[PDB]
């Protein structure tokens, strides 16, 4: 952000380059918090690999 600040010599948009902002701008798929991360990754990998879902 400092490089962009010195380049455009202006103010960055509020919440610049934040996951909330970058999922608005479509470059980010989903926002997942760390405690849920293990189960979410297991579920997504099981579905994509077409494997049976993990038992929780």
């Amino acid at each position: 952000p400092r490089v962009i600040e010195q380049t455009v010599r202006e103010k960055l948009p509020p919440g610049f380059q934040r996951s909330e902002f970058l999922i608005e701008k479509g470059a980010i798929d989903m926002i997942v918090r760390r405690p849920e991360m293990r189960l979410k990754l297991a579920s997504i990998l099981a579905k994509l690999m077409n494997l049976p879902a993990p038992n929780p």
Partner: protein
């Protein structure tokens, strides 16, 4: 919030709902609620049956856009499970008018893509009343490619008034994005099943609707142009829209008899808004039955069959 022709049913429902509250409202009133509620419900059911015995293409359009009706999110919640929403077009933004994601159905993961309108006015504003910007179509292309990669079935929904005719949509290659969608979806190696929940059409909705199977609801319309637009163009008047709707044949039986779809999904009496759960059950059963037989086909033979059905399009 009801339509014009729903006044006999509307009046009685302002009295049935109160009786539950009147059971303990005030003054120690716990009247013989049960029998009166049952009689009023019988009367309301008979009136609804009599009213919806008479149906019209305009009435069909009104029910298709009744401002209370299951959208894609409702059908996903009440017919699917384990839905993980994927967003982002990778290019410019994530337009809310298209909702896509990956979910499991009877142990088989599926890709669900469909438009979403919104219940409250604020949600309708936020979702642009279901009008997809081109970036949404690019997102749908990306999701379809991802589903194609990992041998995954694709089931999509079509509930949108029309592709958004905005400044930004035209500035950002609207036609280009729709064409790019329509080219790749004819090369997918997995079955594609689509439903016409709500009101859908206008050609733009076809970017997620070229597949082996097509199904329609009982009170849904699928037209090349909007009936109001068709009236304002051809009849030189907006108020002749019901006449244009009658002439076109946007109603479900007309589009069924034209051999353009597979079958009409029935609705609960009173339309889908009266019992959305029964509608969801019917939709789940129909989609499961449709997905059952299609999965037998191999990818090469599936693409060849799709191409032959693609050639089957048109009268000539």
């Amino acid at each position: 919030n009801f339509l014009d022709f729903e006044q006999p049913i509307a009046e009685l429902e302002a009295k049935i709902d109160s009786l539950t509250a009147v059971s303990r409202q005030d003054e120690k009133l716990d009247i013989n609620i049960d029998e009166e509620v049952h009689r009023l419900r019988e009367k309301s059911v008979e009136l609804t049956r009599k009213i919806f015995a008479d149906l019209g293409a305009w009435q069909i359009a009104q029910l298709a856009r009744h401002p209370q009706r299951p959208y894609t999110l409702d059908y996903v919640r009440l017919a699917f499970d384990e839905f993980d929403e994927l967003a982002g077009d990778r290019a410019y933004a994530d337009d809310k008018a298209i909702v896509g994601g990956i979910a499991r159905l009877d142990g088989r993961p599926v890709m669900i893509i469909g438009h979403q309108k919104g219940r409250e006015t604020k949600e309708k504003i936020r979702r642009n009343f279901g009008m997809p910007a081109p970036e949404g179509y690019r997102k749908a292309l990306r999701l379809m490619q991802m589903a194609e990669r990992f041998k995954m079935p694709i089931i999509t929904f079509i509930d949108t008034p029309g592709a958004y005719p905005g400044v930004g949509a035209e500035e950002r290659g609207q036609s280009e994005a729709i064409a790019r969608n329509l080219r790749e979806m004819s090369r997918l190696g997995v079955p594609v099943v689509c439903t016409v929940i709500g009101e859908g059409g206008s050609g733009g909705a076809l970017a997620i609707g070229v597949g082996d199977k097509v199904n329609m609801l009982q009170y849904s319309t699928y037209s090349v142009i909007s009936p109001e637009g068709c009236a304002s163009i051809l009849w030189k008047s907006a108020d002749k829209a019901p006449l244009a709707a009658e002439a076109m044949g946007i109603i479900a039986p007309r589009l069924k008899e034209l051999k353009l779809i597979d079958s009409i999904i029935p609705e609960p009496l009173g339309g889908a808004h009266r019992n959305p759960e029964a509608m969801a059950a019917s939709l789940k059963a129909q989609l499961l039955a449709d997905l059952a037989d299609l999965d037998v086909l191999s990818t090469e033979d599936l693409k060849n069959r799709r191409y032959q059905r693609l050639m089957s399009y048109g009268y000539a």
